[PDB]
């Protein structure tokens, strides 16, 4: 019924990353991150800037033709802080409020 991809939000500390890719994952689309839309170097992982960048990523997504997507959240992990960032919720909140479709999301920490 819908066209699907994966969004794969990488919520790290001091910046949070997103890159909505195809179902294979090798083909990326419209990456632009949260630290890009602010110039203070302190709010690169803030939830307020996370809402602004995820709205722009949701803007470029439907502009291609993609209408539905899943996401795999991802903290830093390994030997690191193992915990998702602040704007990882705010990235997921802003794209869902934009009007996209969500189903069966998971963790890839």
């Amino acid at each position: 019924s819908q066209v699907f991809g994966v969004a794969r939000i990488y919520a790290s500390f001091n910046d949070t990353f997103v890159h909505v890719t195809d179902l294979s994952g090798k083909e990326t689309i419209a990456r632009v991150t949260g630290g890009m839309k602010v110039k203070a170097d302190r709010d690169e992982s803030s939830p307020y800037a996370a809402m602004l960048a995820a709205q722009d990523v949701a803007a470029k997504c439907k502009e291609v033709g993609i209408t539905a997507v899943h996401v795999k959240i991802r903290a830093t992990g390994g030997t690191r802080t193992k915990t998702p960032g602040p704007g990882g919720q705010a990235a997921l909140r802003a794209l869902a409020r934009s009007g996209l479709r969500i189903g069966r999301i998971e963790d890839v920490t």
Binding site: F4, G5, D22, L23, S24, G25, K26, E27, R104
Partner: peptide, 27 residues
């Protein structure tokens, strides 16, 4: 299953012969 995107098929790297190696992990 789903949708992907490859490339426009030309002479000198058409879309088909080039990669063929993507993987789709799915429940």
């Amino acid at each position: 299953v789903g949708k992907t995107l490859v490339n426009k098929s030309t002479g000198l790297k058409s879309a088909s012969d080039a990669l063929k190696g993507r993987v789709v992990e799915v429940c």
